[PDB]
Structure 1
Amino acid sequence: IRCIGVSNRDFVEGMSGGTWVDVVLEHGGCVTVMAQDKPTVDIELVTTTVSNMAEVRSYCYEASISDMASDSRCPTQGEAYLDKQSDTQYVCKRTLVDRGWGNGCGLFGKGSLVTCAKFACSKKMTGKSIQPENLEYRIMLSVHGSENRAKVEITPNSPRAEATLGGFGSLGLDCEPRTGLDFSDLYYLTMNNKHWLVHKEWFHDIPLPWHAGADTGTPHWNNKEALVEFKDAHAKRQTVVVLGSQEGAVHTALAGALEAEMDGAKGRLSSGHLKCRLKMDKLRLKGVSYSLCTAAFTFTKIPAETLHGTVTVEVQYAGTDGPCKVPAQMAVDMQTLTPVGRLITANPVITESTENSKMMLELDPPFGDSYIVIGVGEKKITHHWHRSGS
C-alpha cells in the first residue's frame, strides 16, 4: 500500500457527487482522496524539474600559476616589456621601483618593472539562468490499495491533464505552480557536484576570476588578480603568488541558500508545491459487484497504527471462491455490527482464486475503543482497537 508511511500526508474527502476537489501537492508528500461511491486515490508529486538552463557565468575558485617572468628598465630607459604582457592567458603587474648603483643602474630614481605569470583555472563553478516556462511537474496517481497507476506531466503553460485508471475510469487535473520562488532573481549554481539556487545580486558580486557563458574556443578569465597577488617588488623582480582554494569560502557563504539537485541534464528542485483541482466525475467503481468471501481470514501482519491514526492490517484468505468481497468493518457493538469509522482502502476484493492469498487494508477507526471485524460468522477476526490522541 502507498502513502501509509508518508509523514506529510493529507486526507481529502470529496462530497456527494461534487465533481471537484482541491489538493495541494508537496514534495515528498501524498494526498489520499476519498469520495462516496469512488475508489480511494493517492496523488503524489514525484519530481519538480527545470529544463534548458542557460549558462550565464563561470567563476574560477581554484587556480595555479606558472612561468613567472620579469622585465626591468633603469631610469630614463623606457617601459619594461614582456611579450606575454598582452597575452590574455597571462596576469601581469607593472610598477615603478627604486634603482641606483647598487642594483645595476647608473642613475638613481624610478625604474620600470613588469612581471607576468600564466594563469590556469583548476576548478570552477557555473551559474545558470532558469525560466518558469521550462518548469515541469511529474505526478503519480494510483488506486489506493493496489493499470491502477498513472503518471502525468504538468507545465505552467499546460496546467490541465487527464489520467486513466483502467476500469475505474479517469481523473482530470488542473494545476498551478506554487514554487515560492522568483526565477528572475535567481541562478542555478553548480560547484563540484553540489547545486544551489542563489540570488543574482550575490552571484554578481563574488570576487573571483570569471568568464561569461561557455564559450568560444579556449577560456578567457577576467579579474585574474582576484586569485593572484604580486608581492612588494624588488629591483628586477616581483614575486607572484596564487591564493588558495575558495571552495570552502563559497560553501560557508552558501550556508543559508536553497539546495538543489541535478538528475540528469535538468535541475531538480527540492522545495515548492503544486496547487491542483481534481476532476472526479469520470472516476467510478468498476461495474461488477462481488459476493462476500465466505472462508476464514487470518492476520499475517497484525494491526499497526500509522502516524496519522489510521490502522493497517495484512490478512490471509483461506478460501478459493475469489474473486470475492472482503467483509471488513469496524463496530462498537459486536451483536448488531453496525459500522463505525471507515475503510481507507475502500471496497476490498480478493482477486485470486488460489488459497491463502494475502491483502493489506487501511482503516480509519473512530476515536476511543472499537473492534476491527474481518470476515463473517464464527471464524471471523475480531481485534480490539484503541484510538487515543496519539
Structure 2
Amino acid sequence: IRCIGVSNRDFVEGGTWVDVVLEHGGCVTVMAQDKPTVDIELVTTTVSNMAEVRSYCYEASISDMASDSRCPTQGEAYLDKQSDTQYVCKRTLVDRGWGNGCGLFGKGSLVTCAKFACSKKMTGKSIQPENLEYRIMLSVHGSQHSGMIDTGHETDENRAKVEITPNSPRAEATLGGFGSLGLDCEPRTGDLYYLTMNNKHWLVHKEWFHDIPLPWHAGTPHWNNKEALVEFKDAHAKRQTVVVLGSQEGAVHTALAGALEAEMDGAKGRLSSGHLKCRLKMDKLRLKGVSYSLCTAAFTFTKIPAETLHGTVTVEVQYAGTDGPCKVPAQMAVDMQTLTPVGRLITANPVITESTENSKMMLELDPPFGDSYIVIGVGEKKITHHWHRS
C-alpha cells in the first residue's frame, strides 16, 4: 500500500518472474493473477566509504607580510620566509635609482611573502562501485485499515526491508502468510567525485575537479598553488602589496550549475537520483485466505472513496459481521440490475481478517472512465457509491 499517494507511480502486471524498474521518488505496484498485489520502492542509494582525494581552499586569509629588495647588480632579494611552506611569495623586478637608494639606475630584485591560511575549504571524495547500497521497501495490499496506513517492518508481515549491494544482488523477502518474494537486481544502470562545500554536495567529473584553479592539498596542511587565492599588486621599489582574492563559494556554486546534486546520511553519501532493474521471483508468493468464504453481513463506508492521481479509488469499509475471516465482495458496476463487473481491483483478494464485529479494512480499485458505482457487500444490504473518472 506504500505506492498509494505517490505521483511517479507505475503499475506492472504479470508466472514465475516479473521485471521491475525502480527509480528514486518512484514506486511500482505489481499485480499477478492468484498472487497478492505488492508495492515496491527504491527508498535510498548510499555510498559507504568515501576516501578524501583532494581539498581546495575557496576562502583564505593572509598575515605577516614582509619584503626584501636589492639594487641593480646586487643579485636576488631574499627572505627567510621564502622557505617556509606556509608562505606565498612573489619575486619581481623594480625600477631603482638614486631616488630610492641605489648607486645605479636599472632593475633591482624584489621579493614579497605573506603567511597563507585557509578559512574555508571544499573536499572531493572517491566513490568505489562496490560501496553502493540500495534499500528497497516492500508493502503488500494485505487489506490494512487506515490505522495500519515505515518502522516495524520486521514484526509486520505486510512490510519488508531489502538491502541490495553490487556484491549481493539477490535477496529473498519473507512476507509471513504471503510466503516470500525473491529479488535479483542489476545496479550497473544506476569518472565521478563526491564534492562537499559548506554542507552542499555534488557528483562532479574527475577532469573538472582536477582542473579547479584554487589552492589544494592531498588526502598542518600544505597548500599547493596558494597563488590562486592571492594577488600581488606592485606598489613601490622596496614594497609590493599583497591581498587575498576573497571567497570563491559563489563562483564555484555557479560553475556547478546543471551538475548532479547529492545529499548526506550521516558519514555516508546519498544518491538522490538512481535507477535499479530488478527481476522478481513470484513462485513463493501466495495469497492468504483462498479458503475464505464471501462475507455475508453488511458493510458501511468509514472513509469517503477518494481518487488517486492515477484515477484509482481507495475505499475504507467497516464490517458488522462475526463470520471473519472472510472475502470482501468488491467491484464496480455500470448497472445495478445486471451488476457485471466494470474496471478491476488493484487489491487482489480483499479480506475482513478478524472474527470480531465492526472491524475496518481498506481496498483500491481501478474504475472505468465516466460514471460507475463502487459496490461493497452482497444482497439487499450491499452499499453503493457513485463514482466518476475524468
Report if TM-score (shorter chain) is over 0.5. Answer: yes
Q: How many Å separate the matches in 2 of 1:155 and 1:128?
A: 20
Alignment deviations for residues 210-237 of structure 1 (CA, whole Å, 9 cap, x no partner):
1112xxxx20001111010100141111
User: By how many angstroms is 1:355 displaced?
Assistant: 3.9
Match of residue 172, structure 1, among 162, 182, 187: 182
Q: Secondary structure at the match of 1:103?
A: coil
Q: How many Å separate the matches in 1 of 2:143 and 2:169?
A: 27
Q: Out of 361-370 and 22-31, give the one that drifted further.
A: 361-370
User: By how many angstroms is 1:369 displaced?
Assistant: 3.2
Q: How many Å separate the matches in 1 of 2:297 and 2:270?
A: 50
Q: Out of 128-137 and 333-342, give the one that drifted further.
A: 333-342
Alignment deviations for residues 282-339 of structure 1 (CA, whole Å, 9 cap, x no partner):
1012356323333322222212221112111122223344333222122233223333
State the TM-score, normalized to the length of structure 2. 0.91
User: By how many angstroms is 1:353 displaced?
Assistant: 4.1
Q: How many Å separate the matches in 2 of 1:259 and 1:196?
A: 4
Q: Out of 20-29 and 101-110, give the one that drifted further.
A: 101-110
Identity %: 100
User: By how many angstroms is 1:19 displaced?
Assistant: 0.7
Q: How many Å separate the matches in 1 of 2:290 and 2:82?
A: 86
User: By how many angstroms is 1:32 displaced?
Assistant: 0.7
Unpaired runs of 5+ in structure 1? Answer: none
1:71 matches 2:77: no
User: By how many angstroms is 1:160 displaced?
Assistant: 1.1
Alignment deviations for residues 22-72 of structure 1 (CA, whole Å, 9 cap, x no partner):
111111111111111111111110111122122111110110101101112
Q: How many Å separate the matches in 1 of 2:66 and 2:332?
A: 88
Match of residue 225, structure 2, among 209, 223, 233: 223
1:208 matches 2:214: yes
Q: How many Å separate the matches in 2 of 1:165 and 1:250?
A: 49
Match of residue 144, structure 1, among 141, 162, 166: 141
Q: 1:192 matched to which residue of 2?
A: 198
Residues 127 and 187 in structure 1, CA contact (< 8 A), matched pair in contact too = yes
Alignment deviations for residues 220-270 of structure 1 (CA, whole Å, 9 cap, x no partner):
001111010100141111100000111100111111101111112221112
Match of residue 340, structure 2, among 322, 327, 338: 338
Q: 2:148 matched to which residue of 1?
A: none
Provide the alpha-carbon RMSD of the alignment. 1.9
Q: Out of 196-205 and 362-371, give the one that drifted further.
A: 362-371
State the TM-score, normalized to the length of structure 1. 0.91
User: By how many angstroms is 1:108 displaced?
Assistant: 2.4
Q: How many Å separate the matches in 2 of 1:131 and 1:69?
A: 46
Q: How many Å separate the matches in 2 of 1:96 and 1:66?
A: 23
User: By how many angstroms is 1:21 displaced?
Assistant: 0.8
Q: Out of 302-311 and 167-176, give the one that drifted further.
A: 302-311
User: By how many angstroms is 1:356 displaced?
Assistant: 3.0
Match of residue 92, structure 1, among 86, 89, 92: 89
Q: How many Å separate the matches in 1 of 2:333 and 2:71?
A: 105
Q: How many Å separate the matches in 2 of 1:349 and 1:285?
A: 11
Residues 178 and 272 in structure 1, CA contact (< 8 A), matched pair in contact too = no
